[PDB]
Amino acid sequence: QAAELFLDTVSTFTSYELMDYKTFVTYTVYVSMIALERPDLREKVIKGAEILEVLHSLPAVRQYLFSLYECRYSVFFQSLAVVEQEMKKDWLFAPHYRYYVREMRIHAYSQLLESYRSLTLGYMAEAFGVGVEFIDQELSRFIAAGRLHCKIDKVNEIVETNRPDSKNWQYQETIKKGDLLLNRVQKLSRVINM
C-alpha cells in the first residue's frame, strides 16, 4: 500500500504539504523493492526517468538499486549494510529495521537459488561474500522458517533446491481453499436446522 501510491512521484516542491522531496525519493525506493520482484519493477523505477534524475544525485542509493537488479550480490551486502545503519536516523523507524533487512536478505537468496538447481555453498564463499558456515547457518534458519524453498546439505556440500510443479502447486491451493469452504458450510448447516 505504501509503494503503490508512492509511485506517483510528480510532486516536487518541499512544502508543508510535500514535506521533503529528496528524502521522499529515498522513502519510495526503499519500500519499492518489496512490493514486487519482477512483475516489471524495472519499468516503474528503473525505466522511470523522473525518478532517475534524483537518484543520479545520490550515488549510494543508486548503487543499492543496480547491484540487486544486475545481480552483483557481494556489493549488494555492502550497500545493504549502509542502508540499515543509515535507517537508524529516522522517526518512523521502529517497524523498519529488524524486518526490512531480513526480508531483503531472503529476497536476494530466493532469486539467486533460481536459475540453479544444483548449487554449492562453496560458490557462496566468494561470489557472494565470505563465510561458508555463515551461509550454512542463515539458510538453515530460513528453510526452517517455512520460506526459501530449497534443501541445504552437509558433506556433499550441494545446496539442492526443490520447487513445486504446476500441478503440485495447484493441488495445494485447492486443498487449502477446499477445507476453508467445507468448514464454512459445516458451521452454516448447524446454524440452520436448530
Binding site: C71, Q111, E114, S115
Partner: protein, 159 residues
C-alpha cells in the same frame, strides 16, 4: 543534432533520427569542423542499430566523408565489420583496439553496450537446439569466450 539525440534515446526510431543527424552535418559542412567531426559518429551509430552495416562503408567512401578521414572512421568501420560478421570477440577486440575513440560515451557507448548485450544471446539461442543437455565449457568453446560471464549471461536469461 539534438533532434537526432532525443529521437535516438527513444530506442524506437533509428531512421528519422538519422535524417536529423544528417541535416546537422550538412549544416556543419566545413564551417565548424570540430562540431562537424562528431556528427558522423552519431549517424553511423544510428545506422549500426539500424542493422545496415554495409552502408557505413558506403558513406565513408562518399566524397563528402573523404574530407574527414582518420581514426574515428576506422573505428566505426571495423565495429560494423565485426557486427556484420557476427563474431562476438571480434567486436570486443575492435572495442579493445580502439579505446579512446569509442569506449567513451558521447553517447554512443550506451547503444554499443545494448547492441553487444543483444548479440550475445543472439548467438546463444542458435546453439542450444542440437542438444537436450550440455556442459558449459563446450558452449564457451562454440562461442569462443570465457565461461564466467556465460554463467552470468545464461542465468539472466532464465531470470
Amino acid at each position: 543534432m539534438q533532434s537526432g539525440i532525443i529521437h535516438a534515446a527513444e530506442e524506437k526510431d533509428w531512421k528519422t533520427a538519422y535524417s536529423y543527424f544528417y541535416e546537422a552535418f550538412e549544416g556543419y559542412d566545413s564551417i565548424d569542423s570540430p562540431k562537424a567531426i562528431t556528427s558522423l559518429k552519431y549517424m553511423l551509430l544510428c545506422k549500426i542499430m539500424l542493422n545496415t552495416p554495409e552502408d557505413v562503408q558506403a558513406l565513408v567512401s562518399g566524397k563528402l566523408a573523404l574530407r574527414y578521414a582518420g581514426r574515428q572512421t576506422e573505428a566505426l568501420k571495423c565495429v560494423a565489420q565485426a557486427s556484420k560478421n557476427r563474431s562476438l570477440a571480434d567486436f570486443e577486440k575492435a572495442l579493445t583496439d580502439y579505446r579512446a575513440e569509442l569506449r567513451d560515451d558521447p553517447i554512443i557507448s550506451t547503444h554499443l553496450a545494448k547492441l553487444y548485450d543483444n548479440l550475445l544471446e543472439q548467438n546463444l539461442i542458435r546453439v542450444i537446439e542440437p542438444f537436450s543437455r550440455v556442459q558449459i565449457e563446450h558452449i564457451s568453446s562454440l562461442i569462443k569466450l570465457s565461461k564466467a560471464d556465460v554463467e552470468r549471461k545464461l542465468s539472466q536469461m532464465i531470470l
